[PDB]
Design an enzyme around this catalytic site. Structure first.
Site, PDB file in Angstrom:
ATOM      1  N   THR A  14       0.806  -1.226   0.000  1.00 43.30           N
ATOM      2  CA  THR A  14       0.000   0.000   0.000  1.00 43.30           C
ATOM      3  C   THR A  14       0.832   1.266   0.000  1.00 43.30           C
ATOM      4  N   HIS A  17      -8.668  -8.853   1.990  1.00 46.22           N
ATOM      5  CA  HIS A  17      -7.762  -9.627   2.852  1.00 46.22           C
ATOM      6  C   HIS A  17      -8.546 -10.722   3.592  1.00 46.22           C
ATOM      7  N   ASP A  57      -4.049   1.332  -5.901  1.00 44.60           N
ATOM      8  CA  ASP A  57      -2.645   1.120  -5.560  1.00 44.60           C
ATOM      9  C   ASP A  57      -2.075  -0.255  -5.977  1.00 44.60           C
ATOM     10  N   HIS A  58      -2.889  -1.328  -5.954  1.00 39.53           N
ATOM     11  CA  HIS A  58      -2.417  -2.742  -6.250  1.00 39.53           C
ATOM     12  C   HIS A  58      -3.666  -3.616  -6.216  1.00 39.53           C
ATOM     13  N   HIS A 115      -1.401  -9.239  -0.904  1.00 39.91           N
ATOM     14  CA  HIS A 115      -0.719  -8.676  -2.068  1.00 39.91           C
ATOM     15  C   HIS A 115       0.688  -8.339  -1.617  1.00 39.91           C
ATOM     16  N   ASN A 128      27.062  -0.691  -8.803  1.00 40.80           N
ATOM     17  CA  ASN A 128      26.518  -0.141  -7.545  1.00 40.80           C
ATOM     18  C   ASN A 128      24.985  -0.229  -7.567  1.00 40.80           C
ATOM     19  N   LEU A 171      21.661   2.897 -13.131  1.00 36.54           N
ATOM     20  CA  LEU A 171      22.259   3.905 -13.987  1.00 36.54           C
ATOM     21  C   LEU A 171      23.642   3.447 -14.494  1.00 36.54           C
ATOM     22  N   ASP A 175      27.336   2.755 -15.212  1.00 34.30           N
ATOM     23  CA  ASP A 175      28.538   2.990 -14.404  1.00 34.30           C
ATOM     24  C   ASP A 175      29.568   3.788 -15.181  1.00 34.30           C
TER      25      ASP A 175
HETATM   26  C1  LIG Z   1      14.550   7.868 -10.499  1.00 31.46           C
HETATM   27  O1  LIG Z   1      14.442   9.298 -10.381  1.00 31.46           O
HETATM   28  C2  LIG Z   1      15.243   9.841  -9.359  1.00 31.46           C
HETATM   29  C3  LIG Z   1      15.070  11.351  -9.114  1.00 31.46           C
HETATM   30  O2  LIG Z   1      15.423  12.020 -10.323  1.00 31.46           O
HETATM   31  C4  LIG Z   1      16.727   9.546  -9.613  1.00 31.46           C
HETATM   32  O3  LIG Z   1      17.375   9.784  -8.361  1.00 31.46           O
HETATM   33  C5  LIG Z   1      18.345  10.842  -8.350  1.00 31.46           C
HETATM   34  O4  LIG Z   1      19.587  10.426  -8.897  1.00 31.46           O
HETATM   35  C6  LIG Z   1      20.690  11.340  -8.864  1.00 31.46           C
HETATM   36  C7  LIG Z   1      21.973  10.647  -9.372  1.00 31.46           C
HETATM   37  O5  LIG Z   1      22.241   9.430  -8.654  1.00 31.46           O
HETATM   38  C8  LIG Z   1      20.912  11.881  -7.431  1.00 31.46           C
HETATM   39  O6  LIG Z   1      21.895  12.912  -7.473  1.00 31.46           O
HETATM   40  C9  LIG Z   1      22.699  12.953  -6.258  1.00 31.46           C
HETATM   41  O7  LIG Z   1      22.113  13.806  -5.258  1.00 31.46           O
HETATM   42  C10 LIG Z   1      22.895  14.216  -4.136  1.00 31.46           C
HETATM   43  C11 LIG Z   1      22.081  15.197  -3.279  1.00 31.46           C
HETATM   44  O8  LIG Z   1      21.033  14.440  -2.710  1.00 31.46           O
HETATM   45  C12 LIG Z   1      20.099  15.144  -1.842  1.00 31.46           C
HETATM   46  O9  LIG Z   1      19.319  16.193  -2.446  1.00 31.46           O
HETATM   47  C13 LIG Z   1      18.238  15.810  -3.313  1.00 31.46           C
HETATM   48  C14 LIG Z   1      17.509  17.033  -3.928  1.00 31.46           C
HETATM   49  O10 LIG Z   1      16.452  17.570  -3.143  1.00 31.46           O
HETATM   50  C15 LIG Z   1      17.302  14.810  -2.602  1.00 31.46           C
HETATM   51  O11 LIG Z   1      16.273  14.368  -3.454  1.00 31.46           O
HETATM   52  C16 LIG Z   1      18.084  13.591  -2.093  1.00 31.46           C
HETATM   53  O12 LIG Z   1      17.166  12.675  -1.503  1.00 31.46           O
HETATM   54  C17 LIG Z   1      17.717  11.343  -1.294  1.00 31.46           C
HETATM   55  O13 LIG Z   1      18.343  11.169  -0.022  1.00 31.46           O
HETATM   56  C18 LIG Z   1      17.548  10.977   1.159  1.00 31.46           C
HETATM   57  C19 LIG Z   1      18.261   9.933   2.022  1.00 31.46           C
HETATM   58  O14 LIG Z   1      19.546  10.407   2.358  1.00 31.46           O
HETATM   59  C20 LIG Z   1      16.096  10.482   0.984  1.00 31.46           C
HETATM   60  O15 LIG Z   1      15.192  11.273   1.725  1.00 31.46           O
HETATM   61  C21 LIG Z   1      15.554  10.357  -0.446  1.00 31.46           C
HETATM   62  O16 LIG Z   1      14.664   9.248  -0.443  1.00 31.46           O
HETATM   63  C22 LIG Z   1      16.669  10.227  -1.504  1.00 31.46           C
HETATM   64  O17 LIG Z   1      17.284   8.949  -1.366  1.00 31.46           O
HETATM   65  C23 LIG Z   1      17.581   8.237  -2.595  1.00 31.46           C
HETATM   66  O18 LIG Z   1      18.724   8.734  -3.320  1.00 31.46           O
HETATM   67  C24 LIG Z   1      19.982   8.659  -2.633  1.00 31.46           C
HETATM   68  C25 LIG Z   1      21.101   9.357  -3.434  1.00 31.46           C
HETATM   69  O19 LIG Z   1      20.898  10.758  -3.431  1.00 31.46           O
HETATM   70  C26 LIG Z   1      20.302   7.195  -2.264  1.00 31.46           C
HETATM   71  O20 LIG Z   1      21.432   7.133  -1.420  1.00 31.46           O
HETATM   72  C27 LIG Z   1      19.123   6.486  -1.568  1.00 31.46           C
HETATM   73  O21 LIG Z   1      19.293   5.093  -1.630  1.00 31.46           O
HETATM   74  C28 LIG Z   1      17.755   6.755  -2.201  1.00 31.46           C
HETATM   75  O22 LIG Z   1      17.650   5.887  -3.309  1.00 31.46           O
HETATM   76  C29 LIG Z   1      19.218  14.069  -1.163  1.00 31.46           C
HETATM   77  O23 LIG Z   1      18.680  14.525   0.067  1.00 31.46           O
HETATM   78  C30 LIG Z   1      24.234  14.806  -4.605  1.00 31.46           C
HETATM   79  O24 LIG Z   1      24.964  15.217  -3.472  1.00 31.46           O
HETATM   80  C31 LIG Z   1      25.001  13.785  -5.482  1.00 31.46           C
HETATM   81  O25 LIG Z   1      26.263  14.283  -5.939  1.00 31.46           O
HETATM   82  C32 LIG Z   1      27.422  13.412  -5.685  1.00 31.46           C
HETATM   83  O26 LIG Z   1      27.866  12.669  -6.824  1.00 31.46           O
HETATM   84  C33 LIG Z   1      28.271  13.515  -7.917  1.00 31.46           C
HETATM   85  C34 LIG Z   1      28.621  12.705  -9.165  1.00 31.46           C
HETATM   86  O27 LIG Z   1      28.304  13.503 -10.289  1.00 31.46           O
HETATM   87  C35 LIG Z   1      29.396  14.527  -7.571  1.00 31.46           C
HETATM   88  O28 LIG Z   1      29.481  15.561  -8.542  1.00 31.46           O
HETATM   89  C36 LIG Z   1      29.179  15.203  -6.215  1.00 31.46           C
HETATM   90  O29 LIG Z   1      30.419  15.739  -5.806  1.00 31.46           O
HETATM   91  C37 LIG Z   1      28.628  14.234  -5.151  1.00 31.46           C
HETATM   92  O30 LIG Z   1      29.717  13.410  -4.741  1.00 31.46           O
HETATM   93  C38 LIG Z   1      29.908  13.434  -3.301  1.00 31.46           C
HETATM   94  O31 LIG Z   1      29.222  12.361  -2.653  1.00 31.46           O
HETATM   95  C39 LIG Z   1      29.667  11.058  -3.055  1.00 31.46           C
HETATM   96  C40 LIG Z   1      28.698   9.975  -2.561  1.00 31.46           C
HETATM   97  O32 LIG Z   1      28.271  10.260  -1.241  1.00 31.46           O
HETATM   98  C41 LIG Z   1      31.145  10.868  -2.639  1.00 31.46           C
HETATM   99  O33 LIG Z   1      31.669   9.630  -3.078  1.00 31.46           O
HETATM  100  C42 LIG Z   1      32.003  12.006  -3.225  1.00 31.46           C
HETATM  101  O34 LIG Z   1      33.365  11.847  -2.860  1.00 31.46           O
HETATM  102  C43 LIG Z   1      31.401  13.401  -2.913  1.00 31.46           C
HETATM  103  O35 LIG Z   1      31.522  13.759  -1.548  1.00 31.46           O
HETATM  104  C44 LIG Z   1      24.116  13.356  -6.674  1.00 31.46           C
HETATM  105  O36 LIG Z   1      23.966  14.377  -7.639  1.00 31.46           O
HETATM  106  C45 LIG Z   1      19.594  12.359  -6.784  1.00 31.46           C
HETATM  107  O37 LIG Z   1      19.755  12.712  -5.414  1.00 31.46           O
HETATM  108  C46 LIG Z   1      18.511  11.280  -6.875  1.00 31.46           C
HETATM  109  N1  LIG Z   1      17.266  11.810  -6.363  1.00 31.46           N
HETATM  110  C47 LIG Z   1      16.351  11.130  -5.678  1.00 31.46           C
HETATM  111  C48 LIG Z   1      15.093  11.895  -5.251  1.00 31.46           C
HETATM  112  O38 LIG Z   1      16.448   9.930  -5.401  1.00 31.46           O
HETATM  113  C49 LIG Z   1      16.896   8.063  -9.890  1.00 31.46           C
HETATM  114  O39 LIG Z   1      18.247   7.915 -10.316  1.00 31.46           O
HETATM  115  C50 LIG Z   1      15.947   7.528 -10.968  1.00 31.46           C
HETATM  116  N2  LIG Z   1      16.128   6.077 -11.128  1.00 31.46           N
HETATM  117  C51 LIG Z   1      16.400   5.597 -12.359  1.00 31.46           C
HETATM  118  C52 LIG Z   1      16.671   4.137 -12.477  1.00 31.46           C
HETATM  119  O40 LIG Z   1      16.469   6.314 -13.371  1.00 31.46           O
HETATM  120  C1  LIG Z   2      -2.971   6.324   7.492  1.00 30.12           C
HETATM  121  C2  LIG Z   2      -2.711   4.916   6.941  1.00 30.12           C
HETATM  122  O1  LIG Z   2      -1.883   4.158   7.560  1.00 30.12           O
HETATM  123  N1  LIG Z   2      -3.399   4.437   5.735  1.00 30.12           N
HETATM  124  C3  LIG Z   2      -2.922   3.227   4.981  1.00 30.12           C
HETATM  125  C4  LIG Z   2      -3.607   1.874   5.352  1.00 30.12           C
HETATM  126  C5  LIG Z   2      -2.865   0.660   4.745  1.00 30.12           C
HETATM  127  C6  LIG Z   2      -3.702  -0.609   5.021  1.00 30.12           C
HETATM  128  N2  LIG Z   2      -3.231  -1.837   4.448  1.00 30.12           N
HETATM  129  C7  LIG Z   2      -2.218  -2.670   4.950  1.00 30.12           C
HETATM  130  C8  LIG Z   2      -2.108  -3.795   4.127  1.00 30.12           C
HETATM  131  N3  LIG Z   2      -3.034  -3.689   3.149  1.00 30.12           N
HETATM  132  C9  LIG Z   2      -3.726  -2.470   3.350  1.00 30.12           C
HETATM  133  C10 LIG Z   2      -4.639   5.142   5.316  1.00 30.12           C
HETATM  134  C11 LIG Z   2      -4.484   6.179   4.226  1.00 30.12           C
HETATM  135  C12 LIG Z   2      -3.792   5.994   3.049  1.00 30.12           C
HETATM  136  C13 LIG Z   2      -3.775   7.013   2.106  1.00 30.12           C
HETATM  137  C14 LIG Z   2      -4.439   8.253   2.369  1.00 30.12           C
HETATM  138  N4  LIG Z   2      -4.499   9.361   1.454  1.00 30.12           N
HETATM  139  C15 LIG Z   2      -3.891   9.358   0.162  1.00 30.12           C
HETATM  140  C16 LIG Z   2      -4.672   9.590  -1.006  1.00 30.12           C
HETATM  141  C17 LIG Z   2      -4.087   9.608  -2.294  1.00 30.12           C
HETATM  142  C18 LIG Z   2      -2.690   9.361  -2.356  1.00 30.12           C
HETATM  143  C19 LIG Z   2      -1.927   9.279  -3.759  1.00 30.12           C
HETATM  144  C20 LIG Z   2      -2.883   8.488  -4.733  1.00 30.12           C
HETATM  145  C21 LIG Z   2      -1.594  10.612  -4.288  1.00 30.12           C
HETATM  146  C22 LIG Z   2      -1.933   9.103  -1.194  1.00 30.12           C
HETATM  147  C23 LIG Z   2      -2.511   9.116   0.098  1.00 30.12           C
HETATM  148  N5  LIG Z   2      -5.111   8.398   3.551  1.00 30.12           N
HETATM  149  C24 LIG Z   2      -5.151   7.389   4.465  1.00 30.12           C
HETATM  150 CA   LIG Z   3      25.472   2.236 -11.764  1.00 25.69          CA
HETATM  151 ZN   LIG Z   4      -3.813  -4.759   1.852  1.00 20.65          ZN
END
Ligand SMILES: *[C@@H]1O[C@H](CO)[C@@H](O[C@@H]2O[C@H](CO)[C@@H](O[C@@H]3O[C@H](CO[C@H]4O[C@H](CO)[C@@H](O)[C@H](O[C@H]5O[C@H](CO)[C@@H](O)[C@H](O)[C@@H]5O[C@H]5O[C@H](CO)[C@@H](O)[C@H](O)[C@@H]5O)[C@@H]4O)[C@@H](O)[C@H](O[C@H]4O[C@H](CO)[C@@H](O)[C@H](O)[C@@H]4O[C@H]4O[C@H](CO)[C@@H](O)[C@H](O)[C@@H]4O)[C@@H]3O)[C@H](O)[C@H]2NC(C)=O)[C@H](O)[C@H]1NC(C)=O
Ligand SMILES: CC(=O)N(CCCCn1ccnc1)Cc1ccc(Nc2ccc(C(C)C)cc2)nc1
Ligand SMILES: [Ca+2]
Ligand SMILES: [Zn+2]
Ligand SMILES: [Cl-]
Ligand SMILES: [K+]
Length: 805
Positions: free
Chosen positions: A159, A265, A308-309, A420, A685, A689, A691
């Site tokens: 969900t 369920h 959702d599913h 699911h 890694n 994307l 390498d």
């Molecule tokens: C699907 O779509 C998404 C979104 O477009 C794609 O994901 C993006 O990919 C980009 C490239 O990998 C990536 O860019 C990096 O971002 C770094 C900054 O990150 C922060 O800011 C953003 C912007 O608001 C934010 O969204 C990020 O949010 C992530 O992190 C937190 C957790 O910490 C979470 O709340 C969130 O869920 C999200 O996590 C996800 O992404 C991270 C990676 O960012 C993963 O670790 C998690 O598993 C999770 O999947 C962040 O808060 C930026 O700093 C990076 O730059 C580094 O690398 C470049 C290389 O060019 C270099 O120039 C820089 O110097 C820097 O290097 C330094 O750090 C290195 C590693 O730590 C180190 O080795 C070096 O020595 C340096 O110190 C980089 O640009 C972008 O953040 C994500 N965005 C999101 C939202 O995920 C995704 O790729 C798509 N998928 C496919 C298959 O296409």
């Molecule tokens: C609060 C809470 O825990 N739940 C989830 C129960 C999981 C139960 N469950 C476990 C196993 N199988 C089923 C309730 C919930 C969920 C979504 C939501 N609003 C919402 C509307 C649109 C969107 C998207 C479409 C943009 C996103 C959020 N309001 C309340």
């Molecule tokens: Ca890669």
């Molecule tokens: Zn369910």
């Protein structure tokens, strides 16, 4: 602490959240135990129920009533949704003929058509047909608006992962909600369904639609509803918000239903108890549409009905127990059910070994109903690895089954008949999409598509620029009457070199041999023509792929195939060839079995060498363009060029050889010719994307030849199979795969049998979208077709699933 002594007087379902210790009146305050003392009395009125009856018509307003039937109710925005029907001779929306909505018909002061997302938990795709009798409102939306036969959810088909993928356009590995249950080792914190940790914003990544809207000046209703708020109240709250003054009124809203998931369920997806939940959802839709009609908004609002599913039949007796496999069951923590995730119970235990856990779980019983994987070996189409919250060890559970640690977990934790969470390609997990409104097309059916695509369209519906996400923006333009997003093709970053003959044979010292000295202006003019690209139009049907990163590479032409050969990775990035329905398969001649030939267009210094393969006891080699498909004995020599060779483990060569010798020809036969593009992928890694060279963890021993983690093929033909692949006038048809390049076939439990019993099944599990290959390679395909770019984006998001209809 909350100072619950404040009051909700004139604040019911307020849109700004107030921070503790001030008491809340918003639609989530219940979930937080933080509502003002008078929230129930003021905000959750129930008196007299939800429907006007003839006697209430023109009543004196009593503010105690749940909703109103007095004359002032339309001005106040709080009539019962059936008010105009009962009291003013109006018809229910569902009874009206459908009429095309060519232009928005909105009240004055609406700046844009609002968007209402009506989301239903557990709503399986086939309910649209199977339940159609008891869902007339939903059936009208579907037949009058734009609908897909189904919409594909993300994995896991749980969900919260799916609702948050709907809200962000991101895979779960990127938004961070990778299951309904999670452990984050950096926070040392646990997220669960029940509880309060899950409300902490650090779990939730990306940028959900409500935040995207707010940052760009478009107001949003609060999307989340506490479970004890009844559906009728949720709908009346949305309609009331829709009567707010222009400057205060949101433009985007969501409704959520816990049904039909809740009953599915308990009763299974098609239990006879399921009819009532489906009737009830339909009635809620009818309430909403009637309420919009009263407000004169039923031809102004875009409505999205989205699930959702789905839901599968799963019972307690279909549980696999890890205690039947592992000796050390108490040394692991399992996330259980319709998927498995395994990690060490204690990080202080250094006798924990993932390799021996995986081995103990691999093809241990004939009928085994789950398959273990290190997460990086999971099918790339699942995009389920690049997050620290995803445990290294994963179990893909067969549809209809659960995995649990020990039997005592299943009866001291049958109680349920549906669940699911399974692989997102499973038919039972598919869910629904319907769009209805001015911005959607009229009576239009669109192909199934993936839920990661919707965020972009929701942004288009609201005139918002989407945050970066995993949809391919433009791929859903065909759902829309207007507001389409007209993407441009990415610019090529690296241009190819076109090498001619530059090296003499004796300059090469690669330790390769070939029996090719067996040796004319009639034939010699011809071979020169072929090496300059004279058959390129036959083998390169949709243009050369564009290279979208900085690199050094050469285009190489041959009679039977064309390649883009990387001087950095020493192998092609892509190899392109066409196989007509009439093509013949031949063998590799005995004298040519070990033949590798230097390519006089490419320096020794930019070539592989045969000595490295001889010295590397684990690694062998294969060819991208297959020698079996050569157009003639003389052409066959081209297939043995060192520039067509790639590193392959012997186990993987069993797979590759069967694909190239048997299956490509089978496809050309079935599809009336195919165009194939094959190449290597390097994703060490596991981030989905391409390498860079400094990320490669493994090389052919002693050399600079990098070893691919995966091999892809894109197989294109004409959608109208009466036309051959190389003379197609219209839309294309494509299937692709990204096969993991593994040193064993442990994934395939039947691999000791003949390739005809197991290889195609492997390939099907690793089916992919062209778009997945684009991310993994930095290449851009289909750049020269006669098709519109939007149509090509749709093709590139296509996944060939192999499920039945
Ligand atoms: C699907 O779509 C998404 C979104 O477009 C794609 O994901 C993006 O990919 C980009 C490239 O990998 C990536 O860019 C990096 O971002 C770094 C900054 O990150 C922060 O800011 C953003 C912007 O608001 C934010 O969204 C990020 O949010 C992530 O992190 C937190 C957790 O910490 C979470 O709340 C969130 O869920 C999200 O996590 C996800 O992404 C991270 C990676 O960012 C993963 O670790 C998690 O598993 C999770 O999947 C962040 O808060 C930026 O700093 C990076 O730059 C580094 O690398 C470049 C290389 O060019 C270099 O120039 C820089 O110097 C820097 O290097 C330094 O750090 C290195 C590693 O730590 C180190 O080795 C070096 O020595 C340096 O110190 C980089 O640009 C972008 O953040 C994500 N965005 C999101 C939202 O995920 C995704 O790729 C798509 N998928 C496919 C298959 O296409
Ligand atoms: C609060 C809470 O825990 N739940 C989830 C129960 C999981 C139960 N469950 C476990 C196993 N199988 C089923 C309730 C919930 C969920 C979504 C939501 N609003 C919402 C509307 C649109 C969107 C998207 C479409 C943009 C996103 C959020 N309001 C309340
Ligand atoms: Ca890669
Ligand atoms: Zn369910
Ligand atoms: Cl989970
Ligand atoms: K070898």
């Amino acid at each position: 602490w909350t100072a619950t002594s404040g009051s909700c007087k004139g604040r019911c379902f307020e849109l700004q959240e107030v921070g503790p210790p001030d008491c809340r009146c918003d639609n989530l305050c219940k979930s937080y135990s933080s509502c003002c003392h008078d929230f129930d009395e003021l905000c959750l009125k129930t008196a007299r129920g939800w429907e006007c009856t003839k006697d209430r018509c023109g009543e004196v307003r009593n503010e105690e009533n749940a909703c109103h039937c007095s004359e002032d109710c339309l001005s106040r925005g709080d009539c019962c949704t059936n008010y105009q029907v009962v009291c003013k001779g109006e018809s229910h929306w569902v009874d009206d003929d459908c009429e095309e909505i060519k232009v928005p018909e909105c009240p004055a002061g609406f700046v844009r058509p609002p968007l209402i997302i009506f989301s239903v938990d557990g709503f399986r795709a086939s309910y649209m047909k199977k339940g159609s009798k008891v869902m007339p409102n939903i059936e009208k939306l579907r037949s009058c608006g734009t609908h897909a036969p189904y919409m594909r959810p993300v994995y896991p088909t749980k969900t919260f992962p799916n609702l948050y993928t709907l809200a962000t356009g991101l895979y779960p590995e990127s938004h961070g909600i990778v299951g309904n249950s999670m452990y984050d080792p950096v926070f040392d914190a646990s997220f669960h369904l029940r509880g309060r940790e899950k409300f902490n914003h650090r779990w939730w990544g990306g940028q959900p639609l409500w935040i995207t809207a707010t940052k760009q000046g478009v107001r949003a209703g609060t999307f989340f509803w506490s479970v004890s708020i009844p559906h009728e109240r949720r709908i009346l709250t949305i309609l009331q918000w829709l009567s707010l003054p222009d400057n205060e009124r949101p433009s985007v809203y969501a409704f959520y239903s816990e049904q039909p998931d809740f009953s599915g369920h308990k009763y299974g997806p098609f239990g006879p108890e399921m009819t009532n939940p489906l009737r009830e959802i339909d009635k809620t839709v009818g309430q909403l549409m009637d309420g919009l009609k009263q407000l004169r908004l039923h031809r102004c609002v875009n409505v999205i009905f989205v699930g959702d599913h789905g839901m599968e039949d799963v019972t307690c007796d279909r549980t696999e127990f890890l205690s039947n496999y592992l000796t050390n069951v108490d040394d692991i923590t399992l996330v259980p059910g319709t998927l498995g995730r395994i990690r060490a119970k204690s990080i202080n235990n250094s006798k924990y070994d993932p390799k021996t856990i995986i081995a103990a779980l691999t093809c241990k019983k004939p009928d085994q109903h789950f398959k273990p994987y290190m997460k990086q070996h999971l099918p790339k189409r699942l995009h389920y690895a690049n997050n620290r919250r995803i445990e290294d060890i994963h179990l893909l559970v067969d549809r209809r089954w659960h995995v649990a640690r020990k039997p005592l977990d299943v009866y001291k934790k049958c109680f349920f008949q549906g669940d699911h969470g399974f692989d997102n390609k499973v038919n039972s997990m598919q869910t629904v999409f319907v769009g209805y409104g001015p911005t959607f097309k009229y009576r239009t059916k669109v192909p199934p598509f993936e839920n990661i695509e919707l965020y972009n369209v929701m942004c288009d519906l609201l005139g918002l620029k989407p945050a970066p996400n995993n949809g391919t923006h433009g791929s859903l333009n065909h759902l829309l009457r207007t507001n389409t997003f007209r993407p441009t093709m990415p610019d090529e970053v690296s241009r190819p070199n076109y090498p001619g003959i530059m090296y003499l044979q004796s300059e090469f010292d690669l330790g390769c041999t070939c029996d090719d000295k067996v040796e004319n202006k009639l034939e010699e003019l011809n071979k020169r023509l072929h090496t300059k690209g004279s058959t390129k139009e036959r083998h390169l049907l949709y243009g050369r792929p564009a290279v979208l990163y900085r690199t050094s590479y050469d285009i190489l032409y041959h009679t039977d195939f064309e390649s883009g050969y990387s001087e950095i990775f020493l192998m092609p990035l892509w190899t392109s060839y066409t196989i007509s329905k009439q093509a013949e398969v031949s063998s590799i001649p005995e004298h040519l079995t070990n033949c590798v030939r230097p390519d006089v267009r490419v320096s020794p210094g930019f070539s592989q060498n045969c000595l490295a393969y001889k010295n590397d006891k684990q690694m062998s080699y294969g060819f991208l363009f297959p020698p079996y498909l050569s157009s003639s004995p003389e052409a066959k020599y081209d297939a043995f060029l060192v520039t067509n060779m790639v590193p392959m483990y012997p186990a993987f060569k069993r797979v590759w050889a069967y694909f190239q010798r048997v299956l490509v020809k089978k496809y050309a036969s079935e599809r009336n010719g195919v165009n194939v593009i094959s190449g290597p992928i390097f994703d060490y890694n596991y981030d989905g994307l391409r390498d860079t060279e400094d990320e490669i963890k493994q090389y052919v021993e002693g050399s600079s030849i990098p070893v691919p983690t995966h091999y892809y093929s894109i197989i294109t033909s004409c959608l109208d199979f009466t036309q051959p692949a190389d003379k197609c006038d219209g839309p294309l048809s494509v299937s692709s795969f990204i096969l993991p390049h593994r040193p064993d076939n442990d994934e395939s439990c039947n691999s000791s049998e003949d390739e005809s019993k197991w290889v195609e099944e492997l390939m099907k599990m690793h089916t992919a979208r062209v778009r997945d290959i684009e991310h993994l390679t930095g290449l851009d395909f289909y750049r020269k077709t006669s098709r519109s770019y939007s149509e090509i984006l749709t093709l590139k998001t296509y996944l060939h699933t192999y499920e039945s209809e």
